[PDB]
């Protein structure tokens, strides 16, 4: 049950040790996050390590990196930090992240768009949780990505064809092609946002 396991005790010990290391040398924290680690660990390492609010001081530098995976990790790390520390500088970096994610929507190709927006789209519900003033920007970005992906879906024959599923209901909760997957991901984060705002 996660909370009551030897894994959780080990996680707490490792978090205490990493907290000591990051206090001793914050450059280690910056280096580790530039390298990145599995995104599955992000709730654990953001909750359990009180010295991760310093990450907000180099998320803009991590976003600027040319590697797509560093950018994706920056978006995910920022989303978890914003849900943790809802500061004015946290919102400023969230605005920057939404802007950079809306900017490279028109820079990426088809495959890179799928690769970038499948992990970074679940970060938008976290931004919207933390910062209600981002709703206009978030939904404008979301409608832009949705229209781009619908256009891309229409280009080729598809097994699912989400366009003619325009009036389907909620799907509260796997060999499909990437464009339909990204369409469904956009819808899924939209229901998560609306559910969060209404609950």
């Amino acid at each position: 049950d996660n909370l009551l396991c030897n894994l959780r005790e080990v996680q707490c010990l490792i978090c205490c040790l990493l907290h000591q290391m990051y206090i001793a040398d914050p450059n280690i924290a910056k280096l580790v996050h530039f390298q990145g680690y599995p995104c599955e660990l992000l709730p654990l390492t953001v909750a359990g390590i009180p010295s991760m609010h310093i990450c907000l001081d180099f998320i803009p530098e991590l976003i600027a990196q040319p590697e797509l995976e560093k950018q994706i990790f920056a978006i995910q790390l920022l989303s978890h930090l914003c849900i943790q520390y809802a500061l004015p500088k946290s919102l400023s970096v969230a605005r920057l992240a939404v802007n950079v994610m809306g900017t490279l929507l028109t820079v990426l190709t088809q495959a890179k768009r799928y690769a970038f927006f499948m992990p970074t789209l679940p970060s938008l519900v976290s931004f919207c949780r933390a910062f209600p003033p981002l709703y206009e920007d978030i939904m404008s970005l979301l409608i832009q990505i949705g229209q781009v992906c619908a256009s891309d879906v229409a280009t080729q024959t598809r097994d699912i064809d989400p366009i003619i599923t325009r009036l389907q209901q909620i799907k509260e909760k796997g060999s499909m092609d990437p464009d339909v997957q990204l369409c469904h991901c956009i819808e899924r984060t939209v229901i998560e946002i609306i559910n969060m705002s209404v609950s």
Binding site: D1, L3, L4, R8, E9, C12, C15, I49, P50, S199
Partner: protein
């Protein structure tokens, strides 16, 4: 040693307790039923053994113990107090929370949660022969529900069944008490309110709610009816939103009746011409519509006092504009 202790045993109990601490490290490892009836049943050294079992046993051991405590569908054999304290201790073992900053979540299935609320009711019945203990055990229930809507709804319907089956027993009254507290803590469940809860009186005493801050924000926001027309349409959205919230979830508004009384106390004395140019009569009209919706749940004792104050403000305004 266990048989000797289960059997009175004044001075030598410490010796035997030391002994089974020495030779039974995981406490309930050997002959589990003997230790289960030692730790949880209907003694003196019980807290010491409970502390050992909490902070000395493996996680599968405690998992099996909580499955035993919550999987007994006939017993009422284990003590409610010891079992509930043990569950709370297990949730809050320091080893699980080491390193957290402590500045701003257990999974359990349906029948286990039903057994948990039955054990809380057993606690309440044992103590009544107050709402303090039943409120005290409430965060344990919420820590086991983890905010799952399905679990909240299942507990709600089980409590409705318990109220109906028990009639108006003392335990039925306690069922209503924790049901209203659960409705307060999780009003996201949009179930219509049964009349049995409307007849409940304890909602308007000291309590804790989740949405009271929001509706407080709503009414103070609607009250600032400044001259900006965009803000005026925003206030109109606030008024009709409060109308819908009044018809949908009345009781949360009913704990905000002195709120509207105070809001109307402020603006009554001001003159007629400034009354119309600063647009405060619309706020009176809005809250009048609210209260018109809020009936007949707006007609109990504390509600009656707030209404009396509000009507004094109303007639003061009426006499203020007799000309």
């Amino acid at each position: 040693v266990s048989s000797l202790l289960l059997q009175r045993l004044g001075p030598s109990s410490g010796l035997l307790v030391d002994w089974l601490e020495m030779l039974d490290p995981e406490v309930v490892s050997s002959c589990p039923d003997l230790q289960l009836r030692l730790l949880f049943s209907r003694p003196s050294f019980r807290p010491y053994l409970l502390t050992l079992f909490t902070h000395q046993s493996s996680w599968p051991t405690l998992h099996q113990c909580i499955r035993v405590l919550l999987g007994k569908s006939r017993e009422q054999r284990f003590d409610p107090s010891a079992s509930l304290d043990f569950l709370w201790a297990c949730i809050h073992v320091p080893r699980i929370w080491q390193g957290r900053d402590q500045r701003t979540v257990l999974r359990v299935q349906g029948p286990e949660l039903i057994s948990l609320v039955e054990l809380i009711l057993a606690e309440a019945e044992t103590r009544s022969q107050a709402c303090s203990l039943i409120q005290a055990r409430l965060p344990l229930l919420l820590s086991c529900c983890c905010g799952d809507d399905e679990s909240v709804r299942k507990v709600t319907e089980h409590l409705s069944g318990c109220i109906q089956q028990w009639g108006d027993s003392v335990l039925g009254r306690r069922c209503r008490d924790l049901l209203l507290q659960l409705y307060l803590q999780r009003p996201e469940l949009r179930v219509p309110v049964p009349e049995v809860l409307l007849h409940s009186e304890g909602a308007a005493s000291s309590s804790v709610c989740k949405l009271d801050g929001l509706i407080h924000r709503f009414i103070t926001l609607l009250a600032d009816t400044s001259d900006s027309r965009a803000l005026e349409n925003r206030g109109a959205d606030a008024s009709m939103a409060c109308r819908k919230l009044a018809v949908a979830h009345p009781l949360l508004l009913l704990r905000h009746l002195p709120m509207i009384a105070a809001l109307l106390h402020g603006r009554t004395h001001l003159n007629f011409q400034e009354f119309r140019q600063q647009n405060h009569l619309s706020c009176f009209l809005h809250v009048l519509g609210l209260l018109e919706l809020l009936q007949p749940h707006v007609f109990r004792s504390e509600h009656q006092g707030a209404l009396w104050d509000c009507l004094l403000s109303f007639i003061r305004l009426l006499l203020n504009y007799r000309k």
